[PDB]
Amino acid sequence: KKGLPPGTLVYTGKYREDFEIEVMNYSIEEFREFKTTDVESVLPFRDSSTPTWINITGIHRTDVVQRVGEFFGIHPLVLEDILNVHQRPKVEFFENYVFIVLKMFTYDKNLHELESEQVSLILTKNCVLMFQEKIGDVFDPVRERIRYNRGIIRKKRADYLLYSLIDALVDDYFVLLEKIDDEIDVLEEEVLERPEKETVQRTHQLKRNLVELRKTIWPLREVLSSLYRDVPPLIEKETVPYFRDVYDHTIQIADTVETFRDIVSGLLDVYLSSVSNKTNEVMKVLTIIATIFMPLTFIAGIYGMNFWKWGYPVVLAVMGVIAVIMVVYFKKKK
Amino acid sequence: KKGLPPGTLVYTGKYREDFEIEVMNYSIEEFREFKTTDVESVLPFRDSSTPTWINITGIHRTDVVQRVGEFFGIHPLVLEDILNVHQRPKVEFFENYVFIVLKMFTYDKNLHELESEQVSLILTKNCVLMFQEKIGDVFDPVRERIRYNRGIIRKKRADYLLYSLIDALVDDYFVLLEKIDDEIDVLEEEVLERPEKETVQRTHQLKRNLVELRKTIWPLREVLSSLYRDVPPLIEKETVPYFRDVYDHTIQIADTVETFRDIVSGLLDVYLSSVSNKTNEVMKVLTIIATIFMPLTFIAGIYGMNFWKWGYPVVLAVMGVIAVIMVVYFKKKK
Amino acid sequence: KKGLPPGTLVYTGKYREDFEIEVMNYSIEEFREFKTTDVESVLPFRDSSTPTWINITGIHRTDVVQRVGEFFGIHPLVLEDILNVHQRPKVEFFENYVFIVLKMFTYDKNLHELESEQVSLILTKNCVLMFQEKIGDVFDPVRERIRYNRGIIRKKRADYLLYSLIDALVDDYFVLLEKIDDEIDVLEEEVLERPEKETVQRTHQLKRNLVELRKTIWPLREVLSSLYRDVPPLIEKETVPYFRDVYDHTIQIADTVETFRDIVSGLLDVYLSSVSNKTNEVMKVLTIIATIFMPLTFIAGIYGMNFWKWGYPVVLAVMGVIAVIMVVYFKKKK
Amino acid sequence: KKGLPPGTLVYTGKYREDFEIEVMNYSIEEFREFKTTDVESVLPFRDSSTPTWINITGIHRTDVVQRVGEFFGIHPLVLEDILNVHQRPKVEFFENYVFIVLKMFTYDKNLHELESEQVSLILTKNCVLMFQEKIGDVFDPVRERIRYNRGIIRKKRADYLLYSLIDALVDDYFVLLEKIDDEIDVLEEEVLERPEKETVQRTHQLKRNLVELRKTIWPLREVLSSLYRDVPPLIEKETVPYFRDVYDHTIQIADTVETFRDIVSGLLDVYLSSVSNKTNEVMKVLTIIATIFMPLTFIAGIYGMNFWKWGYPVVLAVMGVIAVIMVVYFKKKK
Amino acid sequence: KKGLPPGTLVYTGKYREDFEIEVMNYSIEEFREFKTTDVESVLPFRDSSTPTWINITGIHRTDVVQRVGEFFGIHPLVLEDILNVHQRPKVEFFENYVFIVLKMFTYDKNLHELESEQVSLILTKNCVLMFQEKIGDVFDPVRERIRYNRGIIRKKRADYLLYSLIDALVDDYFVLLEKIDDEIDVLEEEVLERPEKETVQRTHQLKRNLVELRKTIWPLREVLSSLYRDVPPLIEKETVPYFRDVYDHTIQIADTVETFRDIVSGLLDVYLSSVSNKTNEVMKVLTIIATIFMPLTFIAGIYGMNFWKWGYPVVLAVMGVIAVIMVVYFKKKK
């Protein structure tokens, strides 16, 4: 089911398994990280001048979110939507904090199905609050840039770090689609030249799969559309243009998914075609052999009477000619 | 049946049974409630210092609705659109009172097709006038929060009471959709593997019911559209943020309804794919036992002539060989 | 067959039968009504202080229309579109008069097909000029309101009179949809279960009707759209609220029509399903009796050899075994 | 081919046979017309204060168009867009003249498909420069209005001359669609009751043609859209109101085209229905004579044994009873 | 493999074969060109007072591109999307340099499916920086115009040279469409009257290839829509109108691809009719020879009784009578 209260902290998902707090504070020269299971050890990062990313992996522990929320000054309505996993990826704007909800898919090969967790992000002063349902993600390459000063992540502010985690999750969508395209191509070829039972079963799954994505990606476009024109954390022409490379990344997917659904729309029709092509050929064999073997067992049936003479190389000779008379007629359709 | 007069008080619904006036007045410290059949006793509540929730259930009583409209100061054209329950969910903005028309869906499981009542809301000064068609609703959580002081409902003003009732009403659609989801997931799956008579029947009703739903949800989103950028009795940064967690809740439902229709649209094309191959499976059996058994019923037919000697293990030997030649020939289509 | 002149007065319609000029002049207290064929007797009303409604039934009298225009002050371009019955319902806001083109459908039960007369309206100073193609209209209740002092038609000015008629015309469309709904709600039931010759025909005609209805209601809503954010003669806070109830009524219709088209769209798809299964109903009986009786007409055909002895109950015993072997095999499809 | 040059005068049309220049100059009481092959005899009509309609029929003569453009001061890009006939119907607003591209369709009756020529219209000081590819245009009624001095064509200025032609060009489309309506009204009838081989050959040509028009009419509507809210040469109190009845006329066309395409849309699906029902009619016949005459040819097959005696009217009595038993079973599907 | 780094420089295509730098510098009377394998030699062109076209064919050399970037002050984020060939055709606007990404199509005739290379363009001061993947392009007519001094390419500025290359590209899409046109116009025919196995194969591929085009031309028009109401380097009344004939052309393309997509849309609905019809032709032959011959193989079967006397011409007379009855009965279906 769903929820019924007015605005309380309740988890909706199904990852009541893991709990970690992977914080990675870093400036221009120094960086420190630690993976703890205590909130009192990570809260003081609030008024820290050094850019800090606070990852909480295991949002089943409600009280922890409430503890982090009441301290940072997050309004009740927002903290709820962090735990409510069936929410529409959105962008909420307030006076002192920016709130963003995102999704992260993980697809299984061969067996068709995809399940996702809700990655919640919040930007305040110099902090990036991250929220996951389960352990393990696709933020590993972002961690790598922090750990060994790769690129320019160390040089930049906190909102860049946000935009670094966003671009990396959008990068995962690329890989996701890149994994889907290879899964369509050959399996879509086996629709025309290998049509049977589960061939349709696997198709309806893809439509559902594609709808699943487009309904999650469609608002992702407007997510970045509202963040391009207003810019509350400003620092304009360094973060904003970097954001276009992420917007070009999101608009890319938008039309890329419409490409798959557009093809799979007319893909189910192709099935009936290659099946109807074999409907007629099974109708052909059945008709020819009834067209010629039916009159000949009929002329043998009346000959099978037993209550004029002549015929063995007389009737069975015209029986051989009439058999050829019907074969020639059967090449005005082949 | 439809209307004809210029704009009088006529009830078009078919619930002329129940009638009970329920009023719930509360402040930050006190709480009072009662259930009566007299309208004169609920009138002085118009100019109350403390927020008041006036629930008038069973509006088939024409003059009773009129009595409230005359006292509170509600324009006659609106009082018509309350008794007329076939209206499109809309939001009217007046200088004094706020008017909202909403729907409440009661869905019957297994046996398909749905019926709905019209919940009309009016917000003036510090009162919320609620108009229902029949006894029994989904606003019990609101009642439960007033009665035992749960959440923050007591602390806030009169407009929050409106938004509290709206949150409970919108949360019903979640369950409504969640019930339709479980009435498709296990029924759509059985469309391909178990296709029969009532399989096409209940398929078309879903198509009807989804359209019935989307044409009521589509304006229901727009009900909140004007209820965002205008907001006359504002109290801004208290109701507006709470509103957004209902606007993102109404969009979620709206787009989830689109997820439903899109799958059901091309669902009937899948049905023909489940038949096409099961038409050809009946074709393969009908052609084989006519292409192997027609030439052998013909050879026995010509051997039935009774007007060369030799064969019993000579002719049946070749009739068996020719029968095997057809087995090899029927393995270029499997 | 259409028009080619620069812009004069040619009646393109098909009702070249009747001609009557009905006039209803009323105030807050007095009321008069008279019917005449003399055009000279109905023109003095142009400068009348009291509101008046002039019905010009049967516009096939080209010269009569020319007389009214040159007197009331009607630009020839506007006069032309009135006799041009193949017009897109529109609203012209000329500096001194309001011009509105409309449509009125009368439906035939059982035997489908629809036809319309173009009801044109003009508001200037204190008079409403009405135009019809034939005798008979849906404006009977309006007359009943003026004659018997019903509602608030006597008390108001001349623009309300215009909106009274428009309210009546829209209310006609409400019954039309219900009549069409009742010609689908019960006819749809026999589309799936009684599949015959004309069953396909009516689907096409309803699709034709709904399009011939769509492209008349789609602009009809936009007629009021421009008539919403403008109104030159105005009296806003006394007309705008009234008019709105009609704009909510037309937007109800606009959606209602799209509701029908949406159902009837994939209604023909259902028809092939009501055939594919019914083809396989017959495919069963045809295959059964040739799969069990074809080897048995073959084993008895080879026993038709006359040129082993043994059995009457020796072969008929295996004939009963081989027959049952095909009865067991035919329960992997049922 | 299309082209490789930057912006030169190249003719990609295929009507290199005719060459005539027709000029009509008038004021209000006088008018002159002459057909000449010289361009130096028509150039001095640029500085003519009285309205001049210069028509250049057969633009294949490259340099002939250039001489007009060089003298009247036409910019290179437009000059090419006169000879390049594939151009998308557009309207160009420049500093000293108004340019308009319009298509004229010639429809072939019975035998389908249609070809087209490009008409170019340039409006300068007091001239309307017309361009054509072949002798044959729907501008005759305009000529006849000038010749016998009909309507009000004389009284007005130059831009009215441009609008007159356009109004007479739009009227051709009313007839053009009228010729398509009938090509559907009569042929679409015999689609459901005359299923041949080349029936689909013509149906597909409507799906080619209805696209051919809507790609030309779509810009046409918008060609007037911009010609509504702009109008540089002004005299709007007689030109703009006249324009409106050409704009509604161009909307009437656009709306009717998409009325046709929607009926033709689900038309082909109707064809499969009339085939699937007639597949059942043949399925009904093919089963009976194999459901009754397959077991009866079998009982005579077991009586084909010749290696009990009893009856002739005893066996044929049970052969006749079993046969009528199957006649009763065949009344559970009809 | 897709991208994972932050915003560095990596080639993503497949053509890591060639490397050529081609520079064309000119003015009113002068012209220069050369092919160098050294990058340092094409650097001082940035500050040339004369317009220059710098082509860097073979971008895979990351260092070469990086060298040009840091020299021209091109921001890394833009430089990425140059080597990142898997992008959306977009237009960027900076104060000093203008950037444009445009796809270029190469099509193989008869044997379907196509391949593309990304052409990057950077305009700054008086230079146009082109970025091809492989040797061979569509910029030949331009090179012809620069050397021989054809047209007005010499007389205009640097931005015109960018526009001269753009029109040369938009023109190639006309050639691409023309090929695909005849790859459909004649191939569409031979699907109805020539139905085969691989015929459905290429039908689906052109469904995809239309998406590949339209989902690349759709934003290729937006490239010019943004490049219309902007004009940073301007040169106004010279380039502004020139652009429009490149905009009108790219509109034509968009209106041409949608045309195919609308015809090829329901092209497979025709194919099921090509089956459905010839299914029933085969159904007619299968029924007749079982409707005339089956009741006569039954009479001859019961006449094959061996356990009345009379006729050879008494039975074969009624055999002929019944055979005729079935012939007359088959004239209610032809």
Side-chain angles (χ1 to χ4, degrees), chain B residues 1-6 77 80-81 84 86-88 90-92 94-95 194-197 200-201 204-205 207-208 211-212 214-215 218 261 265 268-269 271-272 275 278-279 281-283 285-286 289-290 293-294 296-297 300-301 303-306 310-312 316 319, chain C residues 141 145 150-152 160 167 171 174-175 178 184-185 188-189 192-193 237 241-242 244-245 248-249 251-252 255-256 258-259 262-263 266-267 269-270 272-274 276-277 280-281 283-284 286-287 290-291 294-295 297-298 301-302 304-307 326 329-330 333-334:
Chain B
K1 283 71 72 67
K2 287 293 171 292
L4 295 170
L77 51 149
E80 183 188 2
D81 294 348
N84 182 20
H86 306 280
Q87 287 286 155
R88 193 62 69 194
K90 60 180 179 179
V91 170
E92 297 290 317
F94 288 90
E95 192 181 348
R194 194 74 285 181
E196 281 302 316
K197 294 296 180 66
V200 194
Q201 285 274 309
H204 191 85
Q205 281 203 7
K207 201 167 192 172
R208 170 179 290 189
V211 175
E212 263 286 322
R214 74 100 69 173
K215 291 298 177 181
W218 220 50
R261 275 206 64 198
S265 182
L268 196 56
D269 284 27
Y271 188 90
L272 279 73
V275 177
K278 291 180 183 181
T279 303
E281 284 181 353
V282 172
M283 276 297 299
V285 178
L286 185 56
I289 300 177
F293 287 68
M294 194 69 185
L296 275 59
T297 198
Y303 231 117
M305 59 182 173
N306 284 132
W310 276 116
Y312 184 91
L316 277 67
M319 291 203 305
Chain C
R145 285 200 286 264
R150 275 182 160 87
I152 47 173
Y160 177 91
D167 194 301
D171 289 355
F174 261 78
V175 182
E178 192 184 20
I184 294 176
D185 280 347
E188 175 191 311
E189 295 287 327
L192 285 72
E193 293 187 347
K237 281 194 173 186
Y242 175 91
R244 275 192 59 92
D245 206 17
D248 283 326
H249 276 74
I251 204 169
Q252 186 85 36
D255 292 347
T256 313
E258 299 302 312
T259 300
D262 207 8
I263 295 177
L267 186 69
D269 286 2
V270 190
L272 270 68
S273 298
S274 297
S276 295
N277 265 32
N280 277 24
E281 276 188 313
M283 283 287 295
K284 292 167 189 174
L286 177 62
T287 198
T291 306
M294 198 64 187
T297 195
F298 150 78
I302 61 168
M305 55 185 171
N306 296 124
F307 66 100
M326 306 311 297
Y329 186 82
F330 271 69
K333 287 185 177 182
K334 279 193 170 185

Side-chain angles (χ1 to χ4, degrees), chain A residues 141-307:
Chain A
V142 183
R143 291 183 168 98
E144 288 293 317
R145 298 198 306 273
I146 306 166
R147 285 171 178 167
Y148 310 105
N149 195 343
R150 290 193 175 104
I152 44 173
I153 192 168
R154 298 286 198 89
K155 295 183 177 184
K156 283 286 292 180
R157 287 174 59 100
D159 55 2
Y160 175 92
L161 167 60
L162 171 71
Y163 285 43
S164 300
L165 289 170
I166 297 169
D167 189 29
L169 190 60
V170 178
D171 284 356
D172 183 52
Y173 280 108
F174 264 89
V175 178
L176 186 70
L177 300 176
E178 225 276 4
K179 286 180 178 180
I180 295 171
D181 188 25
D182 285 25
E183 277 285 318
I184 300 170
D185 274 315
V186 179
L187 282 69
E188 160 267 318
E189 283 279 324
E190 299 284 19
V191 177
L192 298 72
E193 293 176 353
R194 201 82 293 181
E196 277 301 322
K197 293 292 173 63
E198 79 151 13
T199 311
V200 195
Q201 286 276 30
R202 219 166 213 180
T203 311
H204 193 94
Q205 263 288 336
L206 266 65
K207 282 186 178 178
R208 174 177 288 191
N209 298 163
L210 273 44
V211 176
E212 280 281 339
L213 279 81
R214 75 93 66 177
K215 294 299 176 185
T216 301
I217 304 162
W218 201 46
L220 255 66
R221 195 203 180 202
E222 290 190 22
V223 156
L224 282 68
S225 290
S226 299
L227 200 60
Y228 177 76
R229 67 172 185 91
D230 202 10
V231 290
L234 38 73
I235 63 165
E236 56 163 353
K237 301 168 189 175
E238 282 301 324
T239 308
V240 176
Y242 168 87
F243 187 72
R244 270 207 59 87
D245 209 331
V246 191
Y247 192 78
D248 284 310
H249 274 58
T250 189
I251 196 176
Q252 192 83 49
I253 306 166
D255 304 351
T256 306
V257 177
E258 285 296 328
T259 296
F260 304 122
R261 219 182 85 166
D262 191 20
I263 290 174
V264 180
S265 173
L267 177 56
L268 194 67
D269 285 330
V270 181
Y271 185 75
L272 289 78
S273 307
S274 294
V275 171
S276 288
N277 260 184
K278 288 199 170 186
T279 300
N280 283 17
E281 278 203 330
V282 174
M283 275 291 303
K284 290 172 185 177
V285 172
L286 181 63
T287 201
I288 317 171
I289 292 156
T291 296
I292 307 174
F293 288 79
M294 179 66 195
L296 272 60
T297 189
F298 151 77
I299 305 168
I302 58 171
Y303 230 109
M305 70 178 183
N306 286 109
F307 55 90

Side-chain angles (χ1 to χ4, degrees), chain D residues 133-147:
Chain D
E133 299 189 64
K134 72 166 189 287
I135 297 286
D137 54 64
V138 285
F139 302 108
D140 276 352
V142 175
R143 295 179 171 90
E144 288 293 321
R145 279 202 295 263
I146 315 167
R147 291 167 183 173

